[PDB]
Amino acid sequence: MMNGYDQLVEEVIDAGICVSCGNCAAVCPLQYISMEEKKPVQDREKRDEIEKRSGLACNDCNLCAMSCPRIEPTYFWQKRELKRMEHEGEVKAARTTYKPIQDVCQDGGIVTTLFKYLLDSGRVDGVVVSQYNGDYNPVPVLAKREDDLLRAAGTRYTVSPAYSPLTDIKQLKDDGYERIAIVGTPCQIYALRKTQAIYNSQRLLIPHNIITFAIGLFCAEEFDDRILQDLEVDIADVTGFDVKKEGLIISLKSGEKKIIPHEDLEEYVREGCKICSDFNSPYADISVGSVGSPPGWSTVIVRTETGREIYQKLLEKGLIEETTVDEKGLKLIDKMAQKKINNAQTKIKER
Amino acid sequence: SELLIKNGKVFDPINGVKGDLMDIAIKDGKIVESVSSGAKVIDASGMTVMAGGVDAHSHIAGGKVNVGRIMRPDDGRSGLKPRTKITRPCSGYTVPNTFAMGYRYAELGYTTAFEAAIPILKARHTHEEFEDIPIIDKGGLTLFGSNWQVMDAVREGDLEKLAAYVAWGLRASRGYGVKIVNPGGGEAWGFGKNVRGLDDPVPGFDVTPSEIILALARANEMLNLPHSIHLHCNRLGTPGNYETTIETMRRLEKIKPSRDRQVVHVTHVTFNAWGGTHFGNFESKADAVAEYLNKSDHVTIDMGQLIFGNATTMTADGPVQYANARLLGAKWGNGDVELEDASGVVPLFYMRKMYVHDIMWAIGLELALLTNDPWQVLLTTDHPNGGPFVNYPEVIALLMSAKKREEEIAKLSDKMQERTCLSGIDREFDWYDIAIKTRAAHAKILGLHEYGKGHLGVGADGDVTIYNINTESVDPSVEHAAVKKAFQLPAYTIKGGEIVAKEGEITATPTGRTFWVDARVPEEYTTRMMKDLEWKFRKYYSVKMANYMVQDEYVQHPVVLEAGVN
Amino acid sequence: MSFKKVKVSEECVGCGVCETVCPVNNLLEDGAEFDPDRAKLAIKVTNGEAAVDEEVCLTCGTCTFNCPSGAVYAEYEP
Amino acid sequence: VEITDAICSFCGSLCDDLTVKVEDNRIVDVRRACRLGAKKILGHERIPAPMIRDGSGELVEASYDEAIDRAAEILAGSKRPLLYGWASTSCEAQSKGILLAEIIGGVIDNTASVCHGPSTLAVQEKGLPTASLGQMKNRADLVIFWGCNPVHAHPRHMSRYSVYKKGFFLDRGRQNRKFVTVDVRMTDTAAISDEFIQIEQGSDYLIVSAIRALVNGKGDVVPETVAGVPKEELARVAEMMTSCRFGMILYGMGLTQSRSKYKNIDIALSLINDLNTKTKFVITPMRGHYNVTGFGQVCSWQTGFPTVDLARGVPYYNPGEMSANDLLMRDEVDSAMIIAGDAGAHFPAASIRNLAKVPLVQIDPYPNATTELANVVIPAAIVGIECEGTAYRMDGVSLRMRKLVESDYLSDEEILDRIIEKVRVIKGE
Amino acid sequence: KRDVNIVTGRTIKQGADIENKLSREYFEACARCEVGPEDLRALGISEGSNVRISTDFGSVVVPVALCEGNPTGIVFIPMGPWANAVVNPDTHGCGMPGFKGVPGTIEPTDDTPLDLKSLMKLYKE
Amino acid sequence: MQTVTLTPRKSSKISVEAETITPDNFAGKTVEEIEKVTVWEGNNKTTLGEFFEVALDGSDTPENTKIVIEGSIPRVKRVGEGMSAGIILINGDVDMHVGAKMRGGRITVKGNADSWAGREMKGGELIIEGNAEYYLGAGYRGESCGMRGGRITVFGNARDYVGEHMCGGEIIIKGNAGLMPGISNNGGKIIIEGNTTMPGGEMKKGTIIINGRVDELVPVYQQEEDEELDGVSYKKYTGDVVAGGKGTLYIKA
Ligand SMILES: Cc1cc2nc3c(=O)[nH]c(=O)nc-3n(C[C@H](O)[C@H](O)[C@H](O)COP(=O)(O)OP(=O)(O)OC[C@H]3O[C@@H](n4cnc5c(N)ncnc54)[C@H](O)[C@@H]3O)c2cc1C
Ligand SMILES: Nc1nc2c(c(=O)[nH]1)N[C@H]1C(S)=C(S)[C@@H](COP(=O)(O)OP(=O)(O)OC[C@H]3O[C@@H](n4cnc5c(=O)[nH]c(N)nc54)[C@H](O)[C@@H]3O)O[C@H]1N2
Ligand SMILES: Nc1nc2c(c(=O)[nH]1)N[C@H]1C(S)=C(S)[C@@H](COP(=O)(O)OP(=O)(O)OC[C@H]3O[C@@H](n4cnc5c(=O)[nH]c(N)nc54)[C@H](O)[C@@H]3O)O[C@H]1N2
Ligand code: SF4
Ligand code: SF4
Ligand code: SF4
Ligand code: SF4
Ligand code: SF4
Ligand code: SF4
Ligand SMILES: [Cl-]
Ligand SMILES: [Cl-]
Ligand SMILES: [Cl-]
Ligand code: NA
Ligand SMILES: [S]
Ligand SMILES: [W+6]
Ligand SMILES: [Zn+2]
Ligand SMILES: [Zn+2]
């Protein structure tokens, strides 16, 4: 049995495992859900008015619950479609040839370069990227210019609700957005396929029917929004972030590096990440990460046919440089993937 | 047109005729004071004349009987008989086809038989089969024990609403009386459960079987119905159930009858007078039930006599049917009726030396012989549950001969004699008491004696049975074989003045009539009741109310009895 | 009632699933009186095909997701 | 005028909540009926008049008396006459067909021989644990569609009784239930289900035998894989069956026409019987035509059997010996009457090749494949549209079909009454 | 030619014109064979192209159609005279022919489907 | 001994029910009395003489009476039904119900036998040199008991439902057997020298021996330790366990 938003409150939001993706807000046909402080909220006054005058519209809907990455699929159709969307890919290592991107990117700048090409080529009208404010609090945006893409390059380890810029399907259609590409964590890419896998999803007025390309980032875990402030960090002097064996490495303007140990980061890990077993995103057209490739290069897993097409276009046009990933790097990727699977199974049974 | 039966010995208990040599005159299907010289004459010298046989409890038509016929082609094959210039083909033994149902009743000397249970939703099927049963007059009792509208009215203590639904339900099903089977149990069976007793609340309705029985008895009397409530008690076929059966009768002592008759008729008490706590110590407690009956004039019962051999159990008691089918590893037919009742059909074979069957066989006989009033215990086999009605002559001969009973007991287990008191019973019913148990009592409990059935008084229907037996020269105790044959093959069976059978052979196949009760209630009672029933039809029933009630096309020859609130 | 509209394609087979699950239809069924031939149902079947009443349709996702033939669809033309 | 509470005359769901708009004796609109029902009720081009095939091999128009007399002569003069169809006419007409079969000493067979006949054979072995459709509507939290595609064959079954309806004990409807489909291909019924168990063709008897073993706690005798299905999946199915509050299996042609035939249904009847030791469980055959159930009911209460051979003036029942296709494959039929059924289009080719060589009488309102082989063609008024009659729903509930429009065509009852009278004169009865 | 297991049964379009068997709508709904993606690709033909389905009991020519729910080796012919030209006529000791699960072969063909009257004419003498 | 030779003098396509062709009924009768024996050609009540030329040699008891049918009779049913003694030799094929309900004697069919051959056999011997159709040694619809005694030997193949509801006696098939031999077996012994599939569904007691290959086993049998029957190693199983059965199923290894 599914109980729409009420089920999400009892089993995900109030349970403390919400990944703040925003998918529930982006699927609701009655615009009941909206993201506030990166937390899903419902307009209960509007729901009560609709139910009192027109009936129980959530009863046989449950679209928000079937779209949540923290709700297990239960129906045959959704499970069948999700399995068909799971794809293995060829592992390679790539790096951008455009200097403005390499100056701000996290590794090889493949995400920023791919999105740049998709916009310059007219393949997409907009892209969902993660920008940030002065305090490094992520700000998801639907970008259509290079300036906005460069301002989003780099990696932030707190939540950036990829679906918040897509909660108004009417406005997107009014603004001429017919094709959109998105970048997100495996939880966010899995959420995209969860909605697309819903029976008759293509007949709903949702942004999931106009998303043409999906990049899934490698992700070990995300931290709560309190991490920066509580950890007492001179944010004004911060230039970038990067999590590795030594812990969260905060690069500073002086060239110095404040290293926070993984042992201190345990209290900041999001509860929803502790039960996540998806490291490489088998649901993305192309998955991009750091592990397995040399520093300054991005590990790319080209999975779908559209991913292979776009990847070759970037190569044919000299927009990226490619190299092979050694056996050592291939095993390291598979080890991190099994590591997350084992820790997720342990934390799930624990509950 | 005119028929005269002369020089016969008449046994008419309804009018107190105890074997008098009197002539029976019939004109235009009705008994008259005298007929003309041109009347056809039957010289019944040395023969016994009785009213046409009446069977107040038998499973002769409907879904349950047809389920038995479909699931039992082996039974069908066992009683096949080709067509003749007068008759259509026959089939079955425990579940005969509609044609043989009427032919075999006529051949046995019966002119009227009533269907023991009509489900309201599927009453059209019952009436469709009635239209194909030849000769006999027919009627049926409508099921109300596990009805949602009944239980709702019982919970609200609204007897006026209940009476309106019973009157409406009888018209919808074209029924004659109120049948109650395992009250509450059918509803509990909706989720695979059963009521454990009289005070076990029914899930989802907050009423108890006892509350359902008393409320329906009160509604039955408010509607001045000809028959009392017909009851198949809770805990049927379970050791120690004799206490529930007696307790149910005690709780009904406080209900006043609207007419001069019983306030309750408890059917097939053979299956509800069980002693012990498990099958190991199982024993007959007919003595306890008979003792209570001998001091309680508000109750009538029928034997539900067991007959050794093939049988097909069929009842609205879904729980006991499944339980018995599992116990025997037998075929199991189930038919839950939405919002109304349960149904189960299980083939059975009663065998001698099976201690449970031997004790059950004795219970029916013990109930009849230990109850002083012959009118209080009707002869039945709960056809075909206890055994096919064609076996009534065996039961008659057992009731009239302690010698036949002794010979039959010798063929059973030794444990039977230790768990029954039948071997020590020497009572033998005479010809007059057999007429009571085979027609007069059946018509009396149903109130049909006031509508021309079960008697040979002037004004009654010309339904007569002439048996080739001289009551003055035959000792029914010693010559029990002769008694059995005489009752098995009556010399003549007369239906409405027309000879329909002679010595077990059909001679004419006229069409019989369907008896049903049209009970009227004040408009406010119906209006209040229809508020609830219309809601049930709008949300839960799977059929439209406009297509639910049985139409006149299924009752082509009715005899509508008028009843209702005073 | 809304910026969008819910429509039924010719793939509809008149199964009545939409007419049974619609929140508007279910609310009307709970009234003092209910006649499926006259009630202002948001979606109902006639001649084996479903039709939407735009004056009362919420444009929710109930009939879209449950339609076994995939005949129900939302339309919005800027 | 609007006629309310009309009854569909197409599938065993026998929907009785239709409202029909009639203008100038023509049906204009049909409310709530699915495509299948609406198309039948709205009508097609019908046979305008009776016809008899001449020496030239052409169907020439003839009077109703000429066609009926030719039909009576054909049937009375036969030693092995077969009367097939009946499933699409009323019980009153079926009763007349049974009486006609008796007078001519013929075989009367329903469409059941090629449909749920094996189900009846299984019921004759184990008994049928079923319930009226309203019971499952109000209580079923588990519904399994086994070898049936209701999305295409019983379109309103799900919306009227099996899934989306709210019940007295299921306040939400579909969300209060779990439905499963067992089939060899992913049908539209399977796509919308909570679970789809794709099995190998003709493997149902093994699958049900293994599930029953697991329900009874005898999993040790079940191998790791049964007909390509893992044991762990079968254990999960058994778990769903024993953990539900009220379960119902709705099965169809996938069990009756596949390998093992009736053996598939009797093992399922044993599974339902065993399941009742754990929870409440029932089963219902998804009966085809609106009145296939009715013929089996009438024939059984009048003869003792669902189908019958009355050659020796006494009922004889034995599918595999006296069924339509058994007799046609053996080439032992010398005359046939096809009424309310299309043998030419729905029997195997080998049977038609033999049926095409015998005198054939067709009683049907529309021209179809059987008309190509018919020597006598008699148009009839349609039950549930042009005349009243009784029909039985798939769950045994009988309802009275309603007359919606007036017609000058003869009803099946009238055509058969006239054949019976003429046959009696020929026979000397 | 490809080995297949034929299943016959109901389709909404087949039932919608079941009482109008001489029409083009009935022919379009019943003279057809639904096949899965692997079999259609291996056949090397497009939807609408004619195929010959052959069994030990007969052969029929009907246009091909795609059904993504059909696994490899499973073909479906809607019930009707075209399907009944290849089904198993054996009654299996209970009066039931083999309508579902008939072994056969499917192959492209230059031949054309036969209308209902022509198909019935083949069974006449 | 008394020998009655019946020679087919026709070839009607309509099934003829001739349950009256038994050494029990023919014993002591004249050629004319045997010719006037009732047979049913469909709904046509007629005489045996219309279908056979009758030649008699002697007059003895049923036990010493031998009937010889010279030719195939693939449309004559119930031949030898209920016979208690004597011999019936059929020089060709025979229709359904051959030896049905027979209690004694012997019937030898030189050709093939149609469905229900030896159904409800209580005793005696039935030999079929050719093949058998469905329900060989089975019972009637809805009956819990079919074959109760006697021996049926088929030298060729048999089709589906061999020995359905068997309660005793023995069935030997030298060829292959169709689907589901030994359904609900309750005391019978079935031997199949060839191949078969899904044997002993719902068996309660009895023995099924298959010397050929069993394509598929019903998942209701408990495998036991292999056993040697006359030196031949057999795979042994007990079941149907789900039906509470304890019958034995032997499949040659
Ligand atoms: C929380 C998090 C954890 C990660 N953990 C790992 C890991 O364990 N191992 C590993 O190999 N790689 C990990 N990555 C991926 C890695 O840090 C790089 O983002 C990736 O290699 C792409 O680099 P790039 O130079 O090719 O792309 P770039 O050109 O640098 O662009 C990166 C893209 O990621 C987007 N982005 C940044 N932060 C977020 C966020 N919080 N949510 C959604 N989108 C965002 C940006 O908008 C930008 O479009 C993680 C990323 C994130 C966001
Ligand atoms: N549109 C339409 N509807 C109709 C009819 C019609 O002709 N057309 N006719 C009506 C009649 S008369 C009837 S009886 C009903 C029948 O309705 P159904 O019982 O649904 O009959 P089918 O659709 O022929 O087949 C049922 C399903 O069985 C599956 N199947 C095939 N082989 C196997 C197997 O080995 N195992 C299993 N488990 N499944 C298998 C098929 O894939 C199919 O989906 O439809 C009725 N409704
Ligand atoms: N290949 C294959 N073949 C099959 C099947 C399969 O699944 N696959 N299924 C089989 C099954 S289960 C069945 S039941 C059959 C289909 O069963 P059929 O009865 O052959 O189905 P229809 O073709 O609809 O034939 C019904 C006929 O009755 C007529 N009719 C309708 N109403 C009336 C009326 O009131 N009176 C009279 N006299 N006639 C009326 C119609 O015009 C129509 O011609 O097909 C069988 N054949
Ligand atoms: S169940 Fe549907 S309408 Fe209700 S809140 Fe969820 S997505 Fe919105
Ligand atoms: S979809 Fe995302 S935002 Fe909504 S409840 Fe689920 S995890 Fe939270
Ligand atoms: S660990 Fe999983 S849930 Fe947490 S941010 Fe990464 S992909 Fe999302
Ligand atoms: S729109 Fe869909 S659910 Fe509604 S009647 Fe049509 S096919 Fe059925
Ligand atoms: S969109 Fe919602 S309100 Fe409108 S017809 Fe569909 S279910 Fe009814
Ligand atoms: S489901 Fe069947 S009975 Fe109901 S409208 Fe459709 S075709 Fe008619
Ligand atoms: Cl009267
Ligand atoms: Cl529309
Ligand atoms: Cl011998
Ligand atoms: Na922007
Ligand atoms: S059917
Ligand atoms: W059918
Ligand atoms: Zn009773
Ligand atoms: Zn009773």
Residue numbers in the entry:
A (entry chain K): 1 to 351
B (entry chain A): 2 to 567
C (entry chain L): 5 to 82
D (entry chain B): 2 to 430
E (entry chain J): 2 to 126
F (entry chain C): 1 to 253
What's in the article?
The crystal structure of the Fmd/Fwd complex from Ca. E. thermophilum was refined at a resolution of 1.97 Å. Compared to the initial prediction of a molybdenum-containing enzyme, the anomalous data confirmed the presence of a tungsten atom in the active site, therefore renaming the complex Fwd. The Fwd complex forms a heterohexameric assembly in which the canonical polyferredoxin FwdF subunit is replaced by an F420-reductase module (CAD7775209, named FwdI). As FwdF was reported to be required for large Fmd/Fwd-containing complexes or supercomplexes, its substitution by the FwdI subunit prevents the formation of higher oligomeric states. The resulting Fwd complex is consequently the smallest ever structurally described. FwdI shares a similar organisation and (metallo)-cofactor content to the ζ subunit of ACDS, with the exception of the absence of the C-terminal extension involved in dimerisation. The six [4Fe-4S] clusters dispatched in FwdBGI would allow an efficient electron transfer between the tungstopterin to the FAD of FwdI, therefore possibly coupling formate oxidation to F420-reduction.
Here, we study the molecular basis of the CO2-generating steps of anaerobic ethane oxidation by characterising native enzymes of the thermophile Candidatus Ethanoperedens thermophilum obtained from microbial enrichment. We perform biochemical assays and solve crystal structures of the CO dehydrogenase and formylmethanofuran dehydrogenase complexes, showing that both enzymes deliver electrons to the F420 cofactor. Both multi-metalloenzyme harbour electronic bridges connecting CO and formylmethanofuran oxidation centres to a bound flavin-dependent F420 reductase. Based on the crystal structures, enzymatic activities, and metagenome mining, we propose a model in which the catabolic oxidising steps would wire electron delivery to F420 in this organism.
